[PDB]
Amino acid sequence: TGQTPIVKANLYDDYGMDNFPNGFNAVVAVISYTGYDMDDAMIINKSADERGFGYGT
Amino acid sequence: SSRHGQKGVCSRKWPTIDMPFSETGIQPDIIINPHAFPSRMTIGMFVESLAGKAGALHGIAQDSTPWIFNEDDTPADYFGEQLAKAGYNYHGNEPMYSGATGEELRADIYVGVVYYQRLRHMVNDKFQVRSTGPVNSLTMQPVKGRKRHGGIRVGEMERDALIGHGTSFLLQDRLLNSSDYTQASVCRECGSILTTQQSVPRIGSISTVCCRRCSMRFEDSQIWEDGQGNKFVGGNETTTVAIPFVLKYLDSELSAMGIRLRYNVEPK
Amino acid sequence: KSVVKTSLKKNELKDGATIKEKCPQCGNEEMNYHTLQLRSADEGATVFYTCTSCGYKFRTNN
Amino acid sequence: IFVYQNNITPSAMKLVPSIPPATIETFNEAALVVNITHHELVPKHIRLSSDEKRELLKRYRLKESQLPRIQRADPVALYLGLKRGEVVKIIRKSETSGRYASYRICM
Amino acid sequence: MDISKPVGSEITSVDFGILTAKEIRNLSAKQITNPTVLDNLGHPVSGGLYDLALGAFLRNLCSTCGLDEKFCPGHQGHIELPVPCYNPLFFNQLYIYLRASCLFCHHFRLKSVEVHRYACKLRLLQYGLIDESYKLDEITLSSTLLNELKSKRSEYVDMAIAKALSDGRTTERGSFTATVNDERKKLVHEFHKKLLSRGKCDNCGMFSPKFRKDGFTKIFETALNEKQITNNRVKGSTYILSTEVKNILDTVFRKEQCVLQYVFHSRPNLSRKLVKADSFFMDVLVVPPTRFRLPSKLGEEVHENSQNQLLSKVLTTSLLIRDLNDDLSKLQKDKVSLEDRRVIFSRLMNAFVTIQNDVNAFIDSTKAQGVPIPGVKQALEKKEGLFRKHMMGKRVNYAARSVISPDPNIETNEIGVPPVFAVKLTYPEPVTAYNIAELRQAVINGPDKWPGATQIQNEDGSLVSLIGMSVEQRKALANQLLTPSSNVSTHTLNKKVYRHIKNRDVVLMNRQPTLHKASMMGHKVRVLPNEKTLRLHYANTGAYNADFDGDEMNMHFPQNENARAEALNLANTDSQYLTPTSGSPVRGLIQDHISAGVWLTSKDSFFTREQYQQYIYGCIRPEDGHTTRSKIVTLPPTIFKPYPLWTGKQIITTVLLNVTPPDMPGINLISKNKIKNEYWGKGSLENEVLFKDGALLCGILDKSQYGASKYGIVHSLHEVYGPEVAAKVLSVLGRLFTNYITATAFTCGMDDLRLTAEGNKWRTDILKTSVDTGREAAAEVTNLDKDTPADDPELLKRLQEILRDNNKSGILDAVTSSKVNAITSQVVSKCVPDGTMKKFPCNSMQAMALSGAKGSNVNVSQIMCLLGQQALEGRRVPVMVSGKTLPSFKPYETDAMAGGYVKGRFYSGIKPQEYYFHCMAGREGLIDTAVKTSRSGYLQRCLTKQLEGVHVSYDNSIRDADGTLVQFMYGGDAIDITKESHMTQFEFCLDNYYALLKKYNPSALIEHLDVESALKYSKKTLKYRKKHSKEPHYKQSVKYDPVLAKYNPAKYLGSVSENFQDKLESFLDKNSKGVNEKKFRALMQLKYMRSLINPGEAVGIIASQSVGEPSTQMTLNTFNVTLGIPRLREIVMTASAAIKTPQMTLPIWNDVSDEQADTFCKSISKVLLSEVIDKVIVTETTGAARSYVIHMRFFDNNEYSEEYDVSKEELQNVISNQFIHLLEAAIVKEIKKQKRANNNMNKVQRDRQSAIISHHRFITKYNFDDESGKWCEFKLELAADTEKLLMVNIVEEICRKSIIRQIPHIDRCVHPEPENGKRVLVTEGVNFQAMWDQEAFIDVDGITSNDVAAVLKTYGVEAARNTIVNEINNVFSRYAISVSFRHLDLIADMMTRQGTYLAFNRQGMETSTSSFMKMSYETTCQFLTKAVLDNEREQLDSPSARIVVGKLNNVGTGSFDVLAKVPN
RNA sequence: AAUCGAGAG
DNA sequence: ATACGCCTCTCTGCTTATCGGTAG
DNA sequence: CTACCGATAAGCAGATCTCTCGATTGCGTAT
Ligand SMILES: [Mg+2]
Ligand SMILES: [Zn+2]
């Protein structure tokens, strides 16, 4: 399940990229809260993962 | 990753109740450490999160072609005015509360929507574990390759680091005791590794290890036969040491060069 | 023989790039700098801090 | 000790080891105007007698040849007239430990 | 390896020999005849290559031993070469010996008495008698005279060897050290050089034919000329057969066995056996067993093995020759001899060549004539070979690899093991009475449920698997898991259960490239329940150089108690707190914890009773053992009314109080931190950290306190309470700063990156000053008037010249860059932190740039203030050929933005042009890192190969593995760097006196020591040193030596360094402070005694790592003298005499003025004739003499004399003497190749012209401006025979060649500014004997130079070692990388251990007792032939030889042996 | 098993 | 169809040719 | 005078961390 970006270049539509979505819009918090994401790691909400967030075959 | 080279592996899947929640009830699906930015310096991700939140609110889309904003028409001012005119904070911050204890966090959290891409380097193609299994042909050492059930390599630099610790039993355990440990038979007299052979046992008699370099032909109870039946007497002064198998293969390759190695057994 | 400036004196070269880092030797406010990314396309940066009074050098990543 | 001004013929160098049990050494007047021991990079070299040499060897359980070796032709052995087998004492002014002594052998 | 299968016998040493063709057939199991590998029916033939003799092949019992395929070892076989062949390993030595032997008398073409002298010297060198070898040449006094001389030589040798054997200086088996080996090799090399340089024999005086060499397998000879035949007569090209040359060499060796038995040996031949010439000839070829020649079976791609292919090729040629020599046999009887016997003879000769080349290609694919099939040599030669790929490093069992993911809930000494590994990896556990409680439960649990077991090993070695069994079977087996044995054979063994990896086990993590020993540590296992990635704490990142963005780490699980105890104690992560490289700490929290600490430990942090108790318990958790009191203890609140309020520093204090053990005081630390006082307000003292009896009273806890900072709190806790307490402190501080960051999170946003209205006003006002910096820089670089317009034609002309000339472009790009960087610094200083609308501590970007958690003030200034000038290499952005820096900018733009000055910022984005320049800079950075990754190391491998044996012995002297001594003391003080940090920190030691005393415990460490003599001698030595040392080092005398020389510092308290004692005395003198000074000195001395490097410490490995691993941090080469890895290659890997940029450091006397110093520079520096000539005008006139008038114009005398200190007379002499002869030499060379103002003379000039005309081959006119010194004209008249000459390029080349004046090897003397206050001249070449003339200017006592070979030549070995150390230290200092001088000293001492300037390469390790180290290093063949010719038995002392044989190493825990004490 | 290409640190 | 015979851009050292200096 | 040597000039041999996937591996004669 891909999505079109909310914020995108004009040339996104001109080259017809919406026929091949690449990523998903996600709500991203710039927060030091977890302690499990310091160098480059990131934390994914477990509920979102159970709801099909970033799923592929 | 985002569209700003902000890659990073998913560390843990945080439970939703443990995730911080905002005043509007939403819990982010991605948490990115604030320390990623000061060195990478991808301010584009900040302004994109601002604009994505504003666009998701107003139900619009904002172009992000470079060089539309200049030193006067700042994107921060633009998308901040858009954010304020929907009730949210001009700087994109949101009062959030800790979902672990319950209390409100010290400062306003910076939230927004950013476009996230899932890269193809999944971790099911990376891990491998081997205890025992298939071994190489002539060295009797683990095979190469994750998909063939092979061991991993303790190389030259690993060996040098394992010596520098003074860890010698550890170095022997990795390089020898768990790679190609073999209890071969040597000639206590002639000092050769693979010149010996098992005597073909006979009815009644018991098989023994016997030399084929220190054995003289019976035609030229200390006798033994071969598989071809050509029996002859030879020195039974043969021993059992602990050596790698690659030593035996190297001794073969040295015989192919006409070069003999004499291994002296310490107890004679 | 030329008419342009050809030679650059050591004294006349002020390397510039003054920052207010703290000097680990003496404590003079000036301590020149330069950043050179190393060891990866993702590894952290290192700055060649250099005092202007005592000449002390410091190349510290963080 | 013989010192010569400019050059040496082969017909002179052919007699250096020709007269035992004595010894003849040769130096050039040029490339001698400066003592190589007064240079601050060169440590104080003190020739060791046999009496303390055997003591050093028994203290460290060494053969003669297992020591660091000093060339029979290097200027320090030229300066000291050091023969083969007699070890030398060196007072190295170390940057970290201050002063310490090490022993080379001429061989 | 099974630990219940003991081995009795060991390989104590190995020796290299030759496998004679007789013993091969003696040891053979079957001869191979026919190349029938597999016939029809898909089976091997009888007597073929894949015979059943050479092993059990497929489902066939081996015909030799009668065993299955999996249990047949693989018996040896052979083939019979009908004609002996040159072995391509011994061919060089055989050809060299042949080329210097006499065919008539069967002796060498050398004097036989000289052969006897060499034999006697070699017999001496076979023992440790190298001095007497040189004393043998003293034996000087025809048949009787020579016999007397040789008898005297032999008897001197024999008596000396008997004396040496008697008095213990040698033994029956000789003494072979590195110096002995070097002398022997040098003697033999000159001995062969002596043999080859012969024209006529000396035993019979009969000339022998020369030989010509075309490659391999082929040797010819040339006929004697007339003169040789006449002498050979009055004495009273062609192919040579292999049997004939074998007979020649057999006779030669039979008659010269006396000398050859010492040439081909290095030890006393206790077997006395002869040296047989059939060594060099492969009469019989040995085939490897079928087990080692098996074919690959890839589906049906069952291809023949390459070894069998080559062997079958040789067999086909053998059968061809066998069938041909039968035809010759019958054709001989027919007696053709001209028409068909000669045809068959030609065929037989070509077939002999073919079979010899077939053996040649079988052994070595290099020499194949006519993708290539690999040979035996190619199976061993390089990294893909056998040493460096199956003995120097092997694939291993019980390992695992996975991606690492972070975890702050493991204890900094643990690893989070996924359950997927926890079911596979197992440990053999023998059952006992203390085990059958839980090993039984594991066996009941089975192979899947964790913890459980997979395999059970029975008493008689039977291996039972639990994988398929049922629960009833597992229950029965665990019921019988400990039963008495009715079989008494194994009544000494107990069953072993292959239990799963539980939590008590230990693991060995690893992350390639393993560039130092810290990158392979030991971790305890914490078995996590969920994921499939190994979990790592954050403190293990500075050690592995690891991030968590997809890095994967190897995990090795040791299977024996010895390796367990190694990884728990020696390689464990708690012991790796400080890197041996420089002693700086390498573990600490990184970023999130650092910012959390800065927040928690500020004055604004107050916590109620519940918050305080929750933080403390959450980070301590006394159920795991973090607390040392069995009950959590707290502190009274800082504020009592109105309501209780603990602070954050009280959180820190309570944590320390709970982790730090009781019965011991707290740390008294006084340090600082990165965040200044001005950032907290007015009168603040928050930059000054302060501890007092374990309580933080001031300052914030920063990166300086946990992290990679010396003398912070975790470092001091280490130094006072051991390493385990600092481990617990880092773990608990990680837990505290984690649970606190969830309660009050840390963020960052767009508000942190903004300025104020007045801040932006300041920024724009200062940037409006950058509209003219570029133009003014250009206007002054073009030496023009200031205020000149940017469109000035003169300015554009000069700018175009600057563009054309690279050096002038560099000048412009330096000056302009200076001015624009000044503007940038003004902007940054003015607008930060006084311009930000959000300020520290609220401003998170500024907070983590100040605290060092992540980022820098450079990054903050780039985001908020300015991006600034982009510099590519040292200059600005590239300029196109048109004068345009970009299409957008006009040609020759005097604008800062045009040249790359980016005035934008990442907060408000950058313009398209600045974006392009910024992309240039980023691409430059990625290109630099590409170059670094491409060419990175091999310096560390070359160092570690030779230093891998050097280790500290129980005598405290460091020495190579065989026994050779390198240093008598590690660094001259024998102290450990991982323990040397706080020795000089006397204030810290004084303040923590009581805790340090309780940790050292002199009560239990004073009975076994002597605490009188060392102190007495140290006092006497210090008194003497105080008396002297106002005198020069060459004038002092060693009445008293250093104390460490006499007394063992680990056994005699007070025997310490000469500088440590001096510094301690200065401290105890300059500050008296209630503990008596006597007890403090005693404590410092016991601390020194405990700060000593343990015997067995791999100083060689550690130094190799310390010089190599930091060198990866300098291989970027941005900005004459060689730096970085090139310089280290010169110094350590090459030891080149020809340094790329030689330089001399020449001190000046303190009275010689600077102007006089520059005059000395001018008088010393080289000046060519080119550098004084303005132009040369060549006026040819062919109207039959081709005149070539030349009029060379000079610079004005007042210019060039003042610039170069050159006089008109000196210039005239150079012209009249050197230049014209050079010119005419060039002219005649060209001709030889081609055949295929006024002259009002004063008669002095006329005599000069006549002299020039006479002395010169073409000159006809000559006149010099003697009065003004401005020109010189001369006619070089020629002949019409010669065609046209350039006569201008010729003059230019000769003018560049010719030198006016020159000190040899010196091209320039430049007087730089003083460094460290000392005046020095630096000249561009090294020639020591030439500066000794100018005593009045140069302090020749201080002349040290860059080159090491020159210093070694003119100053000896020790000066060379000192300059080596200074040079290898100068590289790291210029990159601000600290390497302990002990490491560099050990490197230098290893390099100059032979009295010469060795190097770390294959040529630098020729002289070494162990040949396995060199064979594994590289050039395996050349090091194996050299080893087998000398019959060099190696004793297995180097670590590499130990690995190759498979014996426990010598360094570290191999330094000793363990014996039991059976008490009955 | 050799090479070629793609990539991960 | 199928078995024999076959084909343009580095950088240290160690080692040798070549047409002349070099003591007795 | 004569070997006898030798300072050039010229030829030649070897290196230049770990890991995972896929795709492809050659052609002329003669019974
Ligand atoms: Mg990484
Ligand atoms: Zn034998």
Ligand SMILES: [Zn+2]
């Ligand atoms: Zn300073």
Ligand SMILES: [Zn+2]
């Ligand atoms: Zn067999």
Ligand SMILES: [Zn+2]
């Ligand atoms: Zn002869």
